[PDB]
Amino acid sequence: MKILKDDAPELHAIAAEVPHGEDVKDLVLDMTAAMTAAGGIGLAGNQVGVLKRIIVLRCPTFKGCVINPIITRHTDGHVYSPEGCLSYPGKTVAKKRRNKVVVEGYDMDWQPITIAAKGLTAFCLQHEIDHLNGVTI
Ligand code: NI
Ligand code: NI
Ligand SMILES: [Zn+2]
């Protein structure tokens, strides 16, 4: 796998929902390995040229993948979140984020999962889900 250059069109494209039960274990393994090899804590399909709704995270309160992630709950208003991104080396942006979120989706074995997160972990979930919608910092 390769983390695509900052001018890759995939970064603006929409990731396709994964058909329920599709075997994506190798994809998840590859994305996880690319994320850690590059020293990151989050990665989305688009960033490695995989236009599928898959994110991987290595965050303080969640480590693993989410397939077909959706945000189902969040706190009102916003807080400041300084963020970088493996697709944009050297760039940090002060983003407005929800302080707390609930994310729902599937793990690699297609077990339904629910992730309640605050602070850094919540910011990462928002950032990575944004990627699947072609939204970048
Ligand atoms: Ni590779
Ligand atoms: Ni661009
Ligand atoms: Zn990113």
Residue numbers in the entry: 1 to 137
Q: Anything the authors wrote about it?
A:
Peptide deformylases (PDFs) are enzymes involved in a pervasive and essential process called N-terminal methionine excision (NME). During NME, PDFs catalyze the removal of the formyl moiety from initiator methionine, found at the beginning of all prokaryotic translation products. We provide the first evidence that some viral PDFs, including the shortest PDF identified to date, Vp16 PDF, display deformylase activity in vivo. To conclude, characterization of the phage Vp16 PDF allows us to unexpectedly uncover the crucial role of the most unusual final amino acid in fully compensating for the 30 amino acid longer C-domain to ensure full deformylase activity.
To gain insight into the properties of these novel viral PDFs, we determined the X-ray crystal structure of Vp16 PDF. The crystal structure of the protein could be solved by molecular replacement using the structure of Pseudomonas aeruginosa PDF without its C-terminal extremity as a search model. Two crystal forms of Vp16 PDF grown under different crystallization conditions were used. Superimposition of all chains showed very similar structures (r.m.s.d. of all of Cα < 0.5 Å). The Vp16 PDF structure is composed of two α-helices (α1 and α2), two 310-helices (η1 and η2) and seven β-strands (β1 to β7) organized into two sub-domains between which lies the active site. Moreover, Vp16 PDF lacks the α3 helix usually found in Type 1B PDFs, as expected from sequence alignments. Unforeseen, Vp16 PDF is also devoid of the conserved η3 helix. Several metal cations could be identified in the structure. Particularly, a zinc cation was identified within the active site, which was coordinated similarly to other PDF structures, i.e., by Cys of motif II, the two His of motif III and one water molecule. Interestingly, the two final residues of Vp16 PDF, Thr136 and Ile137, lying very close to the active site, are involved in a network of interactions unseen in any PDF thus far.
